[PDB]
């Protein structure tokens, strides 16, 4: 369905072959394509957004509609900030793939599932370490 992360590219879910080793050339190419497409789309979306912001901005004589026109922009800019934060994550994932150190948990050497990588291709940890880290995070944050 044209709504996921595999949809953005014209790629279909992979299929690990019976005696296929984990990280082979084809899988690495696959994931590189995925990440590059994801990035380029996000950058083009930012370009759209900026053009919209540049076109709309005007000086309104009513204080209760300047807020109206500056309350959708705040949300838009929020989304753009979040995606800007994710572009650095994608760049780092492209560095791990280019360095051929992609597909394993950063905490413990266990390899991260292929289906998990097709779910969230930027995954850095295994589900267990991810959950434990998320707990430590929410506890140090809240």
């Amino acid at each position: 369905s044209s709504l996921s992360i595999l949809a953005i590219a014209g790629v279909e879910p992979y299929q690990e072959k019976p005696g296929e080793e984990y990280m082979n050339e084809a899988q690495l190419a696959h994931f590189r394509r995925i990440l590059e497409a994801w990035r380029n789309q996000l950058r083009d979306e930012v370009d759209r957004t900026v053009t919209h912001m540049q076109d709309e901005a005007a000086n309104f004589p009513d204080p209760v509609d300047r807020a109206a026109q500056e309350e959708e922009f705040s949300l838009e800019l929020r989304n753009r900030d979040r995606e800007r934060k994710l572009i650095k994550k994608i760049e780092k994932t492209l560095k791990k793939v280019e360095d051929e150190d992609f597909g394993y948990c950063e905490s413990c050497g266990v390899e991260i599932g292929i289906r998990r990588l097709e779910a969230r291709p930027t995954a850095d940890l295994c589900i267990d370490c991810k959950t434990l880290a998320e707990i430590r995070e929410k506890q140090m944050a809240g």
């Binding site: 209760v64 509609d65 807020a67 109206a68």
Partner: protein, 49 residues
């Protein structure tokens, strides 16, 4: 099989002043706000209708 309670009626979300504006469901919150604020300032005319 889990709902313990339920809203008494739809109108309980808003005050009387805002409750008087018809078709609130289609109005942006800001304009509802000003509507109620100014509506409370209306002056009685000679003949109420």
């Amino acid at each position: 099989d889990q709902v313990d309670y339920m809203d008494v009626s739809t109108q309980q979300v808003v005050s009387v002043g805002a409750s008087l504006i018809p078709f609130l469901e289609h109005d942006d919150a800001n304009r509802a706000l000003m509507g109620a604020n100014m509506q409370r300032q209306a002056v009685p005319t000679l003949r109420a209708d």
